[model samples]
Target: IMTRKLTFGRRGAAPGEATSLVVFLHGYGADGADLLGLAEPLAPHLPGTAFVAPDAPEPCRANGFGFQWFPIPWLDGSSETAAAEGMAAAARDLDAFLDERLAEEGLPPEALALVGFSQGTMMALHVAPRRAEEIAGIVGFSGRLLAPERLAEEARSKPPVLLVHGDADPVVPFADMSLAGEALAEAGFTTYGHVMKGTGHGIAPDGLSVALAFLKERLP
Candidate 1:
């Protein structure tokens, strides 16, 4: 059975007609509004590109006011089984949500991109490759790949990916960027990475700048 329908907040295209779509996936313990604010800086650069941020399917167990795409065993003391199950369910919900958004915007798969942070980044990495049609690209910030062993056999598309991470991230290991990159490259993806020097577990100006350039190049 399908999971719950995702609710989202959107920022319309600057030209008032959307020719491309960028979907933001916020980190754990954050709602859609948290990342929807990013459109303020990005919209001016991406004319005719609609931006949307969707709330995760489950309310965060650790933070009552926020949401989590899936349970984190280390952070929230959830079981491995629970985490795996949650990831699968959330992936299904996200896949359906992407199709709905693309249909609503009347854009083809290649006209869409995904920007994800932390746990949301994990979701983007997992879902985008499994889609039947290739997306424009993916920008993943402060996140790592899950189930890398299965990517080669399960991947249906090979979209370009840009992963940015802080060198001193305390939450998710900084080395995860390279690890994820290795797996992606092995699976025939064009992967790129950026290091936010001395930064923590958050987006930095340089990282955002790099992401902006990538999106501009990837999206039509």
Candidate 2:
């Protein structure tokens, strides 16, 4: 199994003062440090939450210093089967990290939220549902669901989801946000999606603000 470890960053509120936790999962070709910066802005709004980000299990095949939850077939137009296998492996690794986070923070599963970007978003969406306990929510950025058709059959837990995508995103097509949103809604999952005009494959200030508010409402 792939290995994962946590990195401590700024805590929004002191220990025992709050019980909420928000974890950031960075995208492919990015490390924990990449998305951990998000806490800088969310810190003010979510002063009662604890933030943690972990490096993905495997080193990124594309970028030496980063990580990937799975290898993207479109990135190289290679085997979709191989890419699917990678996601499965990553899901296991990510699950372990999530279990550890809940234990470490002493947070009830429902008080925890998972935030992901790109490939990281894929992992969060894929794994959160399969968890034994329902998570507070999931906020996915610039991500597409690899295999939505198969989820309902294997579905376990269904938590609220908020997907934010960029219309101009070249890496992951903008239509994917709607594709995923429609599928989730069809599956009876609470879902919300927002498209950023003229934006690409990254979070904009508006998305960040919306996510903070969403998590704030869900956590407490």
Candidate 3:
């Protein structure tokens, strides 16, 4: 697996504590810093929770100013093979990063949670369930599972999951939330979601509120 240096933004946790870890993975064409801003709003409710958003493995092929976990040539009706390969490589990079963070915090695997947006949500849903140990939870916004067909056979952990998406999402289909939610339930994962009315491909106030409550319950 190819490993890339990861850059991250952090918030809330003290230097020394067995604090819970929350990882935020940003969308395609966006860097870690973008989603890290959400920590400002969420920090108060999560006293000992540590938030970290890591820039993805590569500079985006789609956008000049940002990073992407993988390329999305299939958006133009091409092949998915390359996208799958990218997900595999990114997954290793992410799994290793998670191990490193959990060790540094001296916390068990279950004390870690993944919160992801857009393409980041794809990564979280793909990697978290395959880990040998279950994490606290996974929160995905405006994304879909890349290989839902393989989930039942591949899943090693079944953490509870929350999926929030806009009903009018243009980047990722609006139906993805329900599709993933149903697949997750079939795979024996506890799943929940909210569809923001008239919203597009972005997080809304209500979605963040739901995510906050979900994280508080799991991380605490």
Which candidate ranks first by lDDT, i.e. highest?
1
lDDT by residue for model 1 over 1-220, one digit each (tens)?
8678999999968433799999999999999998888898998899889999999999998997899999999889999999999999999999999999999888999999999999999999999999999999999999999989999999999999999999999999999999999999999999999999999999999999999999999999
lDDT of each: 0.94, 0.83, 0.90
**Considering every candidate listed, which one attains the maximal TM-score?**
1
| Model 3 CA lDDT for position 191 | 97
Per-residue lDDT of candidate 3, residues 1-220 (tens digit) = 3577687888878856647999999999899998999999998889898888999988887767898888897653325887778888899899888888888788898999999999999999999999999999999999998889999999999999999999998879998888899999999999998888899999999999999999999985
Higher-ranked by TM-score: 1 or 3: 1
Q: What is the overall TM-score of model 3 with all chains considered together?
A: 0.96
Query: Of the pair 1 and 2, which is ahead by lDDT?
Result: 1
User: Candidate 2 — what's its lDDT?
Assistant: 0.83
| Candidate 2, backbone clash total | 0
User: How far off is residue 120 in model 1, in Å?
Assistant: 0.4
Measured by TM-score, how close is model 2 to the native structure?
0.92
Q: Candidate 1 — what's its lDDT?
A: 0.94
Off by over 4 Å in 1: 14-16
Q: Candidate 3: lDDT over CA atoms?
A: 0.90
Task: Point out the higher-scoring one by lDDT: 1 or 3.
Answer: 1
Candidate 1: worst 10 consecutive residues by lDDT? 10-19
CA RMSD of all predictions? 1.1, 1.9, 1.4
Kindly list the per-residue Cα lDDT of model 2 for residues 1-220, writing each as its tens digit: 4454534344566766667888888888888877888888887888788888887776677766777767766674548887877788778877887787778677789998999898888888899988988999999999977779888976689999999999999889899999999988888889997778899999998888789888989997
